[PDB]
């Protein structure tokens, strides 16, 4: 476990303005999702059949260590609830029900129900994650180290290890892909550290 991870986590979490600046982007989304009027940190997915839908955060990270919390009620996950990161090129919509985040070279994601990591998922098989194994609770932390070029996760205070490597040099945004009608996913930026 990196020492920098605890340094970031043990600072008081970012305030509302920062949370809002790093929240889901209403300009960068599948047309089937919308940022809630009463809660700018959460999106709502319209109940569209045979549709996979994504949204990126407003901020693309290039350097430093960053973490954010995803709150995704377990009952609102369906067959493919994928959490991760993506370049600006990652498609935010697919037909059918797919692990859209992690489907090609432009995104990396953890499919919550399958407990599988996808990257270039159309050509590469999913990877079991965590490596030691797992029923996922409603919230999890996503840790993006743009200096080491890693993606990691924290579930129930437990650091689950490195999920992905080779992210340095990219501009990566928080992203999720959802298939469940009426699902609501909240993202709250925790904090960032400089390189």
């Amino acid at each position: 476990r990196p020492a920098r991870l605890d340094q970031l986590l043990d600072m008081p979490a970012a305030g509302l303005a920062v949370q809002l600046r790093h929240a889901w982007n209403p300009e960068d989304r599948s047309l089937n999702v919308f940022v809630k009027d009463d809660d700018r940190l959460t999106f709502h997915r319209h109940p569209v059949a045979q549709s996979t839908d994504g949204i990126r955060g407003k901020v693309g990270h290039a350097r430093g260590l960053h973490a954010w919390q995803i709150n995704w009620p377990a009952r609102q996950r369906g067959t493919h609830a994928v959490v991760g990161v993506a370049t600006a090129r990652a498609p935010l919509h697919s037909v059918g029900y797919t692990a859209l985040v992690g489907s090609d070279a432009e995104s990396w994601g953890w499919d919550l129900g399958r407990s599988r990591l996808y990257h270039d998922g159309k050509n590469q098989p999913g990877v079991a994650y965590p490596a030691f194994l797992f029923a996922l609770p409603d919230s999890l932390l996503v840790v993006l180290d743009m200096d080491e070029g890693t993606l990691s996760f924290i579930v129930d205070g437990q650091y689950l290890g490195v999920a992905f490597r080779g992210l340095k040099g990219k501009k990566l945004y928080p992203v999720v892909s959802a298939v469940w009608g009426h699902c609501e996913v909240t993202m709250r930026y925790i904090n960032g550290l400089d390189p």
Binding site: P47, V48, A49, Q50, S51, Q76, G78, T79, Y97, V179, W180, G181, H182, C183
Partner: peptide, 8 residues
């Protein structure tokens, strides 16, 4: 509703 992803 046949759909298993709450899309009905």
């Amino acid at each position: 509703x046949v759909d298993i992803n709450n899309n009905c």
